[PDB]
Amino acid sequence: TNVVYYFTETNNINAYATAEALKAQTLADAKREASRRQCFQGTTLKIGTIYSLNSDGLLVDEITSKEDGKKWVDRY
């Protein structure tokens, strides 16, 4: 399948990690899948596209993020 969205689960919004591919094809599905793939309490979720990644595969330019217990906040 083709990959549109990626996510990371980090300890806070200023920490970076290698992007993991999502199966979702829309943003609303990506948010639901990313919340369901979150392992831990208290972590931060970021979602981005292929253009959100640097050359090392790190998710640095997320299009939306979600602090634990809060709603998704889009960049714009």
Author numbering: 2 to 77
Could you share sentences copied from the article?
The evolutionary arms race between prokaryotes and phages gave rise to phage anti-CRISPR (Acr) proteins that act as a counter defence against CRISPR-Cas systems by inhibiting the effector complex. Here, we used a combination of bulk biochemical experiments, X-ray crystallography and single-molecule techniques to explore the inhibitory activity of AcrIF6 and AcrIF9 proteins against the type I-F CRISPR-Cas system from Aggregatibacter actinomycetemcomitans (Aa). The biochemical analysis revealed that both AcrIF6 and AcrIF9 interact with the Aa-Cascade complex and interfere with the DNA target recognition; however, AcrIF9 binding to Aa-Cascade also stimulated non-specific DNA binding. The cryo-EM structures of Pa- and Pp-AcrIF9 bound to the Pa-Cascade complex indicate that two AcrIF9 molecules bind to the thumbs of Cas7f.4 and Cas7f.6 subunits and the two AcrIF9 binding sites are similar.
We solved the crystal structure of Aa1-AcrIF9 protein at 2.3 Å resolution. Aa1-AcrIF9 is composed of a five stranded, antiparallel β sheet cradling an α helix. The positively charged surface can be observed within the structure of the Aa1-AcrIF9 protein. The M1, M2, and M3 mutations disrupted the AcrIF9-mediated binding to non-specific DNA as the smeared DNA bands disappeared in EMSAs with target and non-target DNA. The M4 and M5 mutations of Aa1-AcrIF9 permitted the Cascade binding to the target sequence leading to unhindered R-loop formation and the Cas2/3-mediated cleavage. The deletion of the L3-4 loop (M6) or its replacement with the Pa-AcrIF9 loop (M7) completely blocked the Aa1-AcrIF9 interaction with the Cascade. However, the stability of these mutants was substantially lower than WT or other Aa1-AcrIF9 mutants.
